[PDB]
Amino acid sequence: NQSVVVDFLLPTGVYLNFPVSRNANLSTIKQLLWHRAQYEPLFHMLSGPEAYVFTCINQTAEQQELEDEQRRLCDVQPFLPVLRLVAREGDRVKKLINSQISLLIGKGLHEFDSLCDPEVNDFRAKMCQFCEEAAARRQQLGWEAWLQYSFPLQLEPSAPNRALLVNVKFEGSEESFTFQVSTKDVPLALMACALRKKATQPEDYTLQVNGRHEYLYGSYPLCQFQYICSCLHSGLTPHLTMVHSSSILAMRDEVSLWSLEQPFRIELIQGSKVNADERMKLVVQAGLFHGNEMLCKTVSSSEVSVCSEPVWKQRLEFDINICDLPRMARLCFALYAVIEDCPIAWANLMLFDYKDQLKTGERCLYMWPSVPDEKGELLNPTGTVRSNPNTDSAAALLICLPEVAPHPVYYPALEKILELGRHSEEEQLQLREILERGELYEHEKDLVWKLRHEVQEHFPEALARLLLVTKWNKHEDVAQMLYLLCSWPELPVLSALELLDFSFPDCHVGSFAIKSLRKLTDDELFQYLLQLVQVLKYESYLDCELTKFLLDRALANRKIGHFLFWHLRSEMHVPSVALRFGLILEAYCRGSTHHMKVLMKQGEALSKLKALNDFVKLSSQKTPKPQTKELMHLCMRQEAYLEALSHLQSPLDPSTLLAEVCVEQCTFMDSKMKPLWIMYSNEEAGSGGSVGIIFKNGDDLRQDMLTLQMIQLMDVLWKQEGLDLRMTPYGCLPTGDRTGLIEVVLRSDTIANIQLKDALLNWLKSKNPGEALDRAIEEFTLSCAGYCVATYVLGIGDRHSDNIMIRESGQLFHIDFGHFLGNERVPFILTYDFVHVIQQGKTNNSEKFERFRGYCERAYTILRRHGLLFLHLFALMRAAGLPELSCSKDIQYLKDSLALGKTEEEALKHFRVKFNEALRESWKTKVNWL
Amino acid sequence: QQDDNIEAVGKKLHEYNTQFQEKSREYDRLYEDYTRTSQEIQMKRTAIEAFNETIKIFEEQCQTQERYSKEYIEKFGNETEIQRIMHNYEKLKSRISEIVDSRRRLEEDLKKQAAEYREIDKRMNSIKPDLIQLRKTRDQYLMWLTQKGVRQKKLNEWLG
Numbered sequence A: 001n002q003s004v005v006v007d008f009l010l011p012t013g014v015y016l017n018f019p020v021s022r023n024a025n026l027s028t029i030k031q032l033l034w035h036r037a038q039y040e041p042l043f044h045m046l047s048g049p050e051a052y053v054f055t056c057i058n059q060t061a062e063q064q065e066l067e068d069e070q071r072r073l074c075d076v077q078p079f080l081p082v083l084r085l086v087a088r089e090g091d092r093v094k095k096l097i098n099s100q101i102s103l104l105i106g107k108g109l110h111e112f113d114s115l116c117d118p119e120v121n122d123f124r125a126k127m128c129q130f131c132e133e134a135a136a137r138r139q140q141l142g143w144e145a146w147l148q149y150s151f152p153l154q155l156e157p158s159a160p161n162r163a164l165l166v167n168v169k170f171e172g173s174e175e176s177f178t179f180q181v182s183t184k185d186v187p188l189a190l191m192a193c194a195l196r197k198k199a200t201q202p203e204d205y206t207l208q209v210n211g212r213h214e215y216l217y218g219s220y221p222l223c224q225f226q227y228i229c230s231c232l233h234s235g236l237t238p239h240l241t242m243v244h245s246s247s248i249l250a251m252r253d254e255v256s257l258w259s260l261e262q263p264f265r266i267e268l269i270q271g272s273k274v275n276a277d278e279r280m281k282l283v284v285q286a287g288l289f290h291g292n293e294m295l296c297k298t299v300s301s302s303e304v305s306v307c308s309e310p311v312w313k314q315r316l317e318f319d320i321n322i323c324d325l326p327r328m329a330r331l332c333f334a335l336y337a338v339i340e341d342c343p344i345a346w347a348n349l350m351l352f353d354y355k356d357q358l359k360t361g362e363r364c365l366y367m368w369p370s371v372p373d374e375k376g377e378l379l380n381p382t383g384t385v386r387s388n389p390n391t392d393s394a395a396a397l398l399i400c401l402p403e404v405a406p407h408p409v410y411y412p413a414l415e416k417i418l419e420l421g422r423h424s425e426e427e428q429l430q431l432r433e434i435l436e437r438g439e440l441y442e443h444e445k446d447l448v449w450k451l452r453h454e455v456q457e458h459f460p461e462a463l464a465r466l467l468l469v470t471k472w473n474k475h476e477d478v479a480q481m482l483y484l485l486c487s488w489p490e491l492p493v494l495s496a497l498e499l500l501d502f503s504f505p506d507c508h509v510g511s512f513a514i515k516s517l518r519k520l521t522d523d524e525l526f527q528y529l530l531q532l533v534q535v536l537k538y539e540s541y542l543d544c545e546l547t548k549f550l551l552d553r554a555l556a557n558r559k560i561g562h563f564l565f566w567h568l569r570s571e572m573h574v575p576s577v578a579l580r581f582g583l584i585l586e587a588y589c590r591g592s593t594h595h596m597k598v599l600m601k602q603g604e605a606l607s608k609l610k611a612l613n614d615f616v617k618l619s620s621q622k623t624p625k626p627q628t629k630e631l632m633h634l635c636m637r638q639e640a641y642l643e644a645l646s647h648l649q650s651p652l653d654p655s656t657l658l659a660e661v662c663v664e665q666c667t668f669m670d671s672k673m674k675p676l677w678i679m680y681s682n683e684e685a686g687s688g689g690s691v692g693i694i695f696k697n698g699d700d701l702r703q704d705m706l707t708l709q710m711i712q713l714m715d716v717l718w719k720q721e722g723l724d725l726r727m728t729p730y731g732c733l734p735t736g737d738r739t740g741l742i743e744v745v746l747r748s749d750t751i752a753n754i755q756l757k758d759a760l761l762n763w764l765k766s767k768n769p770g771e772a773l774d775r776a777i778e779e780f781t782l783s784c785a786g787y788c789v790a791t792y793v794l795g796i797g798d799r800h801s802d803n804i805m806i807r808e809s810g811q812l813f814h815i816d817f818g819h820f821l822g823n824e825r826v827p828f829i830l831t832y833d834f835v836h837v838i839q840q841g842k843t844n845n846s847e848k849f850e851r852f853r854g855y856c857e858r859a860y861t862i863l864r865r866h867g868l869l870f871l872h873l874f875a876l877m878r879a880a881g882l883p884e885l886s887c888s889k890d891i892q893y894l895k896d897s898l899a900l901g902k903t904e905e906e907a908l909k910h911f912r913v914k915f916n917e918a919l920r921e922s923w924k925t926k927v928n929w930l
Numbered sequence B: 001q002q003d004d005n006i007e008a009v010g011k012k013l014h015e016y017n018t019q020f021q022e023k024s025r026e027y028d029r030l031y032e033d034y035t036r037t038s039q040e041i042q043m044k045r046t047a048i049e050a051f052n053e054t055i056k057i058f059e060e061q062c063q064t065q066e067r068y069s070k071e072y073i074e075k076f077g078n079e080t081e082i083q084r085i086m087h088n089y090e091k092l093k094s095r096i097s098e099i100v101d102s103r104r105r106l107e108e109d110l111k112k113q114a115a116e117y118r119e120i121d122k123r124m125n126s127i128k129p130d131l132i133q134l135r136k137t138r139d140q141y142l143m144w145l146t147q148k149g150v151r152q153k154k155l156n157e158w159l160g
């Protein structure tokens, strides 16, 4: 029901308990409280209502001063209905942000303090300072810079000389100007024209794509802008708005290590809260690692008897001296259960801490449970270094690092490495052969190591090969390798992407990789943002270069920060990254107060949609669809719901405004998880006046995102070389635990639906009558090619009429990418009914059909040229632990799909055969129906 | 020096594969419960923190009531204002006990769900040997049939 009894604690010590409406804002609750407090003792002592602020305990267990009193008690969602009156005192700005961050990032800030961890304490101090400075600095500079930050340009991958008409208006005025300008006119010239036409000075304006935060500015012609290019293509008139600089200011405003030759050792002491077979015995297998490489042979404990609290009190000694241990040395445990084999659990530990100090004394590791995979390896060196946050219930291994020296010891500084690393026709042929044309063989490894000065001089791109041949168990070899690395020439982006892989743990390698990624444009960095976030799971320490780099780009570009926020926020349920991701989101937030407000609004919409979908899920199983639909409308229409779901920036595109929910057009889909189909209005021109979002809850959307990201990357690579295959790379955004959003492509239907012989061909006639049909067949042709190559290369099977869609424009696109990388080889696939439409209804139309074959072939050719980029991006995504992208074989599938082990012509000849066979297979499939 | 028929080994491949797929689905169900239970325990631990923080402000209010009342309440001939102040303070004290009672109730749930967590992980760790043995066995039989030169399409139909 509506009302809730609320406990009120007054600053005099007096206590009131009366009921209030869940829907009542805190301002309304102040008045009712004062009205009742006057009939209670010590009233006269109190100051006025406005002299106090309500304090509650929110859902994240923190105290929150509720400064915004236009908020409903039900929105505030305090732990128990308890409100305390306190003074408005001290830094109210600091107290409000700290409270908002906690709610926004999911995790409460207090949970960072509770750790009593210097490494967390130093990360928060250093990174929050850096983000606050960058945001203060940002507040100084001029509306243009701030517009570049807030609303960076959406350009066609250009970054035809026709002329067309453009509707223009001014800010706060119903009247408008239509007039022709050139496709190649820069945007200032459009501004000057509407200024003179207003009168019948212009650099203190900008052009807003209206109903949107998409602005047109800078030295770029009209056709290079996505809004224009989109408008040109459809033949629709762009609609703009002139906006005065002052209106943009309105928005802006509101002992040495190498001396220790004694071998490295631990005391294994005790296990804890172990859950195992009483009949069996327990073993702890231990090993040292640097990336994937064993630094020495593994060593085991004795077989102690299975119990909750097993005790070893054993010493484990390793075939390596302390002086040999590289910076990123990693001690890796697994608790095994044996008779007289069961991996129980595992835990890894860095030997040097975040300040470079060799660790000494008792350390208590809270283990992660082992999963059985195909590889079935003994230890799990790729695993996280962070301790399991379930510290009360989770298994644990107590061990003791020994006191190796009277004074504490650090890994040597850079200068001391340069010192040790300074002092050191025929063979060119064996090296050339080995490098030029992936796993090397130990005979090759010692040659590459010998001719390593030759690799830096003649094969700079082979740095990665050289780093693996290096013997990281020998400090001499490490010192020599790092000496070269400091003088190594800058590698291109493609090479640097490879160096972010787990095989390269050393901080000087990550540093060097990031140095070479600093040349990324914001556009290109956007294409790899998903892979760069997953790579953080391989990081050892919290303060790392890749984190600083990502916060630098997030603070300088608001779009990058938006998608950085959501990639991190959607994994805050995941215990292994919650802490790391939480700290980055706190720092991000402190450098991004404006966007905090946008993300707060988006977070509450999603919270309401989760609650809404959970209602619809239940009802579906209780009652038929039309009355569930009408109950969903009733629930949405409630003041709180409707306000939460209205007037927010799209999480899918912050420049898009989801303004007015269209309740009667809202529904849900008949899929398992009953995903909600939410419709919205806006102040846009035409097609974009109406927009839709699918809120999905219960499925993993990460597979679809990766797939759509890769189709988006393919489209850019294709468009970059002057081929537009009319793709539909719709937005997909994970937002939470098995939760995210999908952008509805409107004026589209599934092929099954439209087929209710020339049923597609008719549907295109009815949507493109008369002289529009030739365009619609070309849209279909070009898109069909693109999605034929795309699904082939990625290995996406299970493609049918229920998961393939046509746009009224004619464009084909795919949905619900469940599978990829074969999860046997998926053949290249031609569907007869698509060949039918391509041929213009004719049995035989060679002219057209060859053009479709070239589109497919040109497309397949452009992806092979960029195939290493696909491999490197896929290699980093292994960090995400998707079922279908686990291992070298899943990577191998792309090398074979793109045929990267074959010459360009050989590849193109093999593709042709597969093409031809798929055409012959096209006939035999269609012949079997009723 | 270097230390049965195909249809029979193919039958056992089919069996062992079926047993393996079944034991994978079983383990998978437990790993949902393990993950779900880990998310619930964590939520209960933060809710316990939320109780503690709620009680902390009630005990500050008591402290406030006793300090702020005393230095005032010497003004006695209103024995009437005094009983109102005390009864109001007894009303506050009475409400802490309800909150304490609720926090204790939640502490008992978590004690139970901590034990469920430990059982899931126990049952998970007694299924792993079966699962792993059943995978390695499945793979031994594939390797044998491939060596014997059995065609991929006969293997495919035994794996389904």
Ligand SMILES: O=C(C1CC1)N1CCC[C@]12C(=O)Nc1ccc(-c3ccc4nccnc4c3)cc12
Residues within 6 Å of the ligand: A667, A668, A669, A670, A677, A730, A742, A743, A744, A745, A746, A748, A749, A750, A753, A815
């Ligand atoms: O089910 C509905 C109504 C209940 C909401 N509808 C309304 C139009 C046709 C249809 C339909 O009957 N089946 C179906 C399947 C998929 C999409 C669809 C449409 C657009 C997308 N865009 C991106 C990603 N996925 C998309 C998926 C749309 C539909």
